[PDB]
């Protein structure tokens, strides 16, 4: 029932290889729905999910206007930050920005976000109050002063409490058949001997949405945190996600081990064991 929208901007300079690339992508939860890329042959905002396609040409043009303006603005910001850090014109640098709104299960604004980073390090973030900034260092303090002068926090607050929430709600309704459908994981446990003395139990979760899941192994009902190999949740490429967790167990203590699976799509949490 809990939903979010985010935009992710990446601006990357590349001295000697033309002007900085700007790319923006938009997500509702784990579903990407829009992209814009200053490097594309003809840069325009493009749909990346079926439910956004129904938006009319005035939506597409509005987005495209915004991201074109951002392309130019970020090129200036890259120049400025290079200066703030006394950096040479030789190196590539990246500004990243992620912002957006969280809704609770009732559809109300839980909180808003707007954070920027420079070469992968926190640089400036809007505080949870949506009215003040946290600047990481003396360079970011310069941006902070600029943004206070432009009344940025007040404008973001209005967006995050207003348009962000309204459009998220619209998208959730238009895409309700996928965005508000939780697909439970399909699960199974595999067993492969590693030697005479030990075997790997691997607990699989496939085909689930959204990406959030808990996979644990227990021995005698106690968590095996330090002994579980736990792979990053990965996209299947069809909107769904995959994950596995593995423990190496003594032969044949296999029945002492249980895999536990929590996910929104399940009627009830699962307890699985290896089934010879």
């Amino acid at each position: 029932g809990s939903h979010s929208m985010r935009y992710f901007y990446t601006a990357m300079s590349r001295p000697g290889r033309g002007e900085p690339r700007f790319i923006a992508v938009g997500y509702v939860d784990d579903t990407q729905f829009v992209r814009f890329d200053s490097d594309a042959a003809s840069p325009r905002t493009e749909p990346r999910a079926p439910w956004i396609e129904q938006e009319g040409p005035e939506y597409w043009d509005r987005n495209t206007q915004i991201f074109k303006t951002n392309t130019q603005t970020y090129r200036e910001s890259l120049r400025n930050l290079r200066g703030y850090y006394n950096q040479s014109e030789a190196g590539s640098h990246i500004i990243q920005r992620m912002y957006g709104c969280d809704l609770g299960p009732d559809g109300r604004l839980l909180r808003g976000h707007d954070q920027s980073a420079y070469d992968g390090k926190d640089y400036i973030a809007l505080n949870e109050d949506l009215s003040s900034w946290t600047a990481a260092d003396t360079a970011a303090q310069i941006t902070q002063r600029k943004w206070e002068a432009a009344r940025v926090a007040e404008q973001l607050r209005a967006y995050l409490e207003g348009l962000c929430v309204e459009w998220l709600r619209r998208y959730l309704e238009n895409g309700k058949e996928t965005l508000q459908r939780a697909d439970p994981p399909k699960t199974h446990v595999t067993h492969h001997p590693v030697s005479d003395h030990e075997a790997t139990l691997r607990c699989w979760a496939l085909g689930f949405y959204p990406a959030e899941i808990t996979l644990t192994w227990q021995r005698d009902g106690e968590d095996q945190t330090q002994d579980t190999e736990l792979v990053e949740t990965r996209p299947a490429g069809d909107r769904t996600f995959q994950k596995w967790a593995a423990v190496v167990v003594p032969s044949g203590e296999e029945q002492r081990y249980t895999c536990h699976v929590q996910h929104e799509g399940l009627p009830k949490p699962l307890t699985l064991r290896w089934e010879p």
Binding site: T73, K146, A150, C164
Partner: peptide, 9 residues
């Protein structure tokens, strides 16, 4: 829909 104001850092 994205935020519409740009501001140089």
């Amino acid at each position: 829909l994205p935020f519409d104001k740009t501001t140089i850092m």
